[PDB]
CSV table of C-alpha atoms and ligand atoms in Angstrom, one decimal:
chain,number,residue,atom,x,y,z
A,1,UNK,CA,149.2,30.0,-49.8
A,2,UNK,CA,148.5,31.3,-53.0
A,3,UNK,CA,144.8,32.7,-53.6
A,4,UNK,CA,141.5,31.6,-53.8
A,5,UNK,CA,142.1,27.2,-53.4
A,6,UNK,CA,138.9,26.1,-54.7
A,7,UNK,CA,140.2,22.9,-55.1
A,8,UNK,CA,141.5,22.8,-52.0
A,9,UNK,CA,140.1,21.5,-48.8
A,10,UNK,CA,140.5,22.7,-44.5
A,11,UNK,CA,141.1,19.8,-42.1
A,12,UNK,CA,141.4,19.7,-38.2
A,13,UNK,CA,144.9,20.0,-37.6
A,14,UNK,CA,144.5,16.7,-35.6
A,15,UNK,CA,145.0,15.2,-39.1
A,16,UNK,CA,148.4,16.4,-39.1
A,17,UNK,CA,151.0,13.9,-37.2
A,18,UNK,CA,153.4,15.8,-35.3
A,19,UNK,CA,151.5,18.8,-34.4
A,20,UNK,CA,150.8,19.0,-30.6
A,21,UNK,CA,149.6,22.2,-28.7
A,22,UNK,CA,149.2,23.0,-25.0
A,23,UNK,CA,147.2,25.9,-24.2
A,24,UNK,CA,148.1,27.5,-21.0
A,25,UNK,CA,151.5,26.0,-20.9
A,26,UNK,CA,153.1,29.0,-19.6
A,27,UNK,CA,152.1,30.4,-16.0
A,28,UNK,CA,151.5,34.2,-16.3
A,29,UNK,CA,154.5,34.6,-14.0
A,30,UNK,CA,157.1,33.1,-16.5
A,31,UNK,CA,155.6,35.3,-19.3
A,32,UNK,CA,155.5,38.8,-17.4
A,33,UNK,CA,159.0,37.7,-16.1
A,34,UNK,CA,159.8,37.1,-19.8
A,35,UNK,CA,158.4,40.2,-21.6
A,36,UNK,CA,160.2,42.1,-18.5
A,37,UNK,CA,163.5,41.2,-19.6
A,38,UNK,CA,163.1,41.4,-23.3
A,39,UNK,CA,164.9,44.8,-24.5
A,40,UNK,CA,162.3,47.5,-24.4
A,41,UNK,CA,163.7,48.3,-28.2
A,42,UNK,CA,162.7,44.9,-29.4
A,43,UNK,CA,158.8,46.0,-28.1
A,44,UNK,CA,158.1,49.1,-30.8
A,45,UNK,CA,154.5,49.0,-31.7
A,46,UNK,CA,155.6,51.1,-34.6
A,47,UNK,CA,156.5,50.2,-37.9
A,48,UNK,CA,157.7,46.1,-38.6
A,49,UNK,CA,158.0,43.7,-35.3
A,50,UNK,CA,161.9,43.6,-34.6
A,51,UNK,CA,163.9,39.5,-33.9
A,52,UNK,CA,166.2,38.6,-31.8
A,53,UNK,CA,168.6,36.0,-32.2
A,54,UNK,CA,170.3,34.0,-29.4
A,55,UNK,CA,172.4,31.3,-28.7
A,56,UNK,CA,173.7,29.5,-25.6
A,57,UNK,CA,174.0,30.0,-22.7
A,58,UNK,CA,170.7,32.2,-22.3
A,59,UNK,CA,169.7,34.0,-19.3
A,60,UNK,CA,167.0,32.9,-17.0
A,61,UNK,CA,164.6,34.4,-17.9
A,62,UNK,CA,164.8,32.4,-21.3
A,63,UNK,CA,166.3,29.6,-20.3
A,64,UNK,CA,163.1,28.5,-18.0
A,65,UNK,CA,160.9,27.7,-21.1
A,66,UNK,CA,163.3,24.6,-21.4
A,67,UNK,CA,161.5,23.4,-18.4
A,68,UNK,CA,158.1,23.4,-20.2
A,69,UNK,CA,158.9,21.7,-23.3
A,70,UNK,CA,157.8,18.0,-23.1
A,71,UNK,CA,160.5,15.8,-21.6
A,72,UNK,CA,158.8,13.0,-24.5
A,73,UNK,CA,159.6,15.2,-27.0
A,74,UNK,CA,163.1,16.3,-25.9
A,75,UNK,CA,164.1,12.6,-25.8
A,76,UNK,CA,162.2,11.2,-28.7
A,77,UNK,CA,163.7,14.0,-31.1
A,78,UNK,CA,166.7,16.3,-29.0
A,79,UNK,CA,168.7,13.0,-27.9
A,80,UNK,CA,167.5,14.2,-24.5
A,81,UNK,CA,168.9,17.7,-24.6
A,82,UNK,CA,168.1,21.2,-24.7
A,83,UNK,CA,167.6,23.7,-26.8
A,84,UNK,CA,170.5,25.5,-28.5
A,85,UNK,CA,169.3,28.1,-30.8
A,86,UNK,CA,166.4,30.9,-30.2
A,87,UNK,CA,164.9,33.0,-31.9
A,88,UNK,CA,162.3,35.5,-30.8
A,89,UNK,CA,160.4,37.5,-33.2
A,90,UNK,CA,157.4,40.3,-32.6
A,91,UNK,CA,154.4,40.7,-34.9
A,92,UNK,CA,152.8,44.0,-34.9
A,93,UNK,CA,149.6,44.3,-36.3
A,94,UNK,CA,149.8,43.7,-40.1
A,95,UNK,CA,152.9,41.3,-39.5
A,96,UNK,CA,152.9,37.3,-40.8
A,97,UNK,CA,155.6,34.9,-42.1
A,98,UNK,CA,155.0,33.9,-45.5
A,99,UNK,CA,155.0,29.9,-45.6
A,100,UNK,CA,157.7,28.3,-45.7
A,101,UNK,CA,159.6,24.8,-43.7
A,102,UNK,CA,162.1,25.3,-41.1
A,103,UNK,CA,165.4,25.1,-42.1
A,104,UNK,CA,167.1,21.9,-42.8
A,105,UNK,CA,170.0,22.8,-40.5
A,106,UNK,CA,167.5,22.5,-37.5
A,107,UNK,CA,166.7,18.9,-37.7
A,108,UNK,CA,163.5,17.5,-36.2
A,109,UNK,CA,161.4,19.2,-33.7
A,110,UNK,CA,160.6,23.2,-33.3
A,111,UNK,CA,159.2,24.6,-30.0
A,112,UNK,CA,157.1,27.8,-30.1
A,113,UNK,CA,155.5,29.3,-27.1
A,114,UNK,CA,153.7,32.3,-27.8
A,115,UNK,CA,153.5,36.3,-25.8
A,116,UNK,CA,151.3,38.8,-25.9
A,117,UNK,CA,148.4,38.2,-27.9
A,118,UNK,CA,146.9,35.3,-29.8
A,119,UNK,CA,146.9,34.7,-33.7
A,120,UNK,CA,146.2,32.0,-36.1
A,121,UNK,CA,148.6,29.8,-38.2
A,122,UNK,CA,148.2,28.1,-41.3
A,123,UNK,CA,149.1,24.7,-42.6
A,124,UNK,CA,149.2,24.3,-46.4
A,125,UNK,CA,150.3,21.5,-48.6
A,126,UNK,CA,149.9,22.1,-52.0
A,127,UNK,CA,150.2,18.3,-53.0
A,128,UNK,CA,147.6,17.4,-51.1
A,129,UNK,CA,145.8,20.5,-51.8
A,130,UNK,CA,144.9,20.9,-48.3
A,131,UNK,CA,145.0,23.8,-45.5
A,132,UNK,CA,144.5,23.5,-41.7
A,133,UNK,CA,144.6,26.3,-39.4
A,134,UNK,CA,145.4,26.9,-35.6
A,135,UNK,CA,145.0,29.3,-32.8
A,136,UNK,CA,147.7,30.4,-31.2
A,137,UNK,CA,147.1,31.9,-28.2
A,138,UNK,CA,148.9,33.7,-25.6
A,139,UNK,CA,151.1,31.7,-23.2
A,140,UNK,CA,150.8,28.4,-25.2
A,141,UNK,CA,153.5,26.2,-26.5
A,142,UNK,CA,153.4,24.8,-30.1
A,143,UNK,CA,155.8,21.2,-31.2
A,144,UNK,CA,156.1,21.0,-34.6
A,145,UNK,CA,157.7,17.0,-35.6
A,146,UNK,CA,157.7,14.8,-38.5
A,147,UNK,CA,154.9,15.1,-41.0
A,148,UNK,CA,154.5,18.7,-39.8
A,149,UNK,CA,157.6,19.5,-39.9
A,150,UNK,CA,158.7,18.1,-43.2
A,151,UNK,CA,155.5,18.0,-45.0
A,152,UNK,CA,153.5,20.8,-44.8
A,153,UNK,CA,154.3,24.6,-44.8
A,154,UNK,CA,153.6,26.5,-42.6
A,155,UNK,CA,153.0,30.9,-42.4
A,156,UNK,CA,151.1,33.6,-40.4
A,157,UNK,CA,148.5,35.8,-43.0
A,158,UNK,CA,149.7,39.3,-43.2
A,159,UNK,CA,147.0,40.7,-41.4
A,160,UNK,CA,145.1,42.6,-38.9
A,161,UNK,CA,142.7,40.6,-37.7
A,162,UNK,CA,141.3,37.2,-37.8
A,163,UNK,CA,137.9,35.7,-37.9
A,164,UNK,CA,137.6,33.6,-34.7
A,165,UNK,CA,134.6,30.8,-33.9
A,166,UNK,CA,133.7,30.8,-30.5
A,167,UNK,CA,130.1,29.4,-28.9
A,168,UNK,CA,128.8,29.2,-32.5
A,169,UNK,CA,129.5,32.9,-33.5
A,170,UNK,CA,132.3,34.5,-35.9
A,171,UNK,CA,134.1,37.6,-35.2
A,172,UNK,CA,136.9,39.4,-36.3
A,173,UNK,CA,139.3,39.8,-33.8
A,174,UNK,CA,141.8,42.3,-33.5
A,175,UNK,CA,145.3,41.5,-33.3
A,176,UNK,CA,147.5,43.1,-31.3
A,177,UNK,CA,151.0,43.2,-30.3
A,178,UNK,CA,152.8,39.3,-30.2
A,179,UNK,CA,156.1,37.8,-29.9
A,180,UNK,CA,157.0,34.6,-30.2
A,181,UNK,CA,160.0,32.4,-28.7
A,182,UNK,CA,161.3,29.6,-30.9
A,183,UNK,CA,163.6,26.9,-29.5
A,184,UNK,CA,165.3,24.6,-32.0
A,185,UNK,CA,168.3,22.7,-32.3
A,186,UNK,CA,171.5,22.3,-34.9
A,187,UNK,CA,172.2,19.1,-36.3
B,1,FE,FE1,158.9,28.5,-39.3
């Protein structure tokens, strides 16, 4: 990310090894019972999206999306465990991430489910002068691994909408309100 990349080229994200997302991971149950039990201060619609940070042992209502995360995953990359470190983050409208890796003191293997709303992420890697982009939507569950993980960048545009192919048109969508849930563990 840094502005215009003529030289650069965008590639499925299937071309980048250790991205997998499920769509519709989450039942609309487990996110209503979710977004019912987040704080009501950490939901302003004014100004910057709030974060919360927390650590074991979570309540129930947190604790579920354990259950949802790939049991593959958890034992290729988590030595078969849980996760022990959350942090869950709201985007108002306007609100992104500048790019950036995960933290080394994380290790392997980052689990996102998304709230709310959808959005779109973007891959970079400026070695390889290449971007590739996905859409996050509501109630889906993001792994990033490996190549993903270690390789490539990753950051939300600071934006308010995002143009959106669907059945051979482009439109710019809205965003609105999301929050996002990411499980990760300490090495
Ligand atoms: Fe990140």
């Amino acid at each position: 990310y840094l502005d215009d990349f003529e030289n650069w080229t965008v590639v499925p994200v299937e071309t980048i090894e250790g991205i997998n997302y499920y769509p519709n991971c989450l039942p609309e149950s487990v996110q209503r019972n979710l977004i019912n039990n987040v704080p009501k201060e950490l939901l302003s619609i004014y100004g910057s999206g709030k974060q919360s940070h927390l650590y074991i042992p979570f309540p129930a209502h947190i604790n579920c999306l354990n259950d949802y995360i790939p049991s593959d995953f958890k034992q290729r990359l988590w030595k078969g465990q849980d996760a022990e470190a959350i942090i869950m983050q709201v985007y108002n409208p306007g609100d992104g991430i500048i790019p950036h890796k995960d933290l080394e003191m994380f290790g392997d293997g980052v689990a996102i489910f998304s709230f709310l709303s959808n959005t779109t992420m973007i891959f970079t890697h400026p070695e390889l002068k290449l971007k590739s982009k996905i859409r996050l939507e509501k109630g889906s569950l993001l792994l990033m691994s490996g190549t993903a993980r270690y390789d490539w960048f990753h950051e939300i545009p600071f934006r308010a909408g995002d143009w959106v192919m669907n059945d051979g048109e482009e439109k710019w969508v809205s965003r609105s309100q999301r929050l996002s849930v990411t499980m990760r563990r300490i090495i």
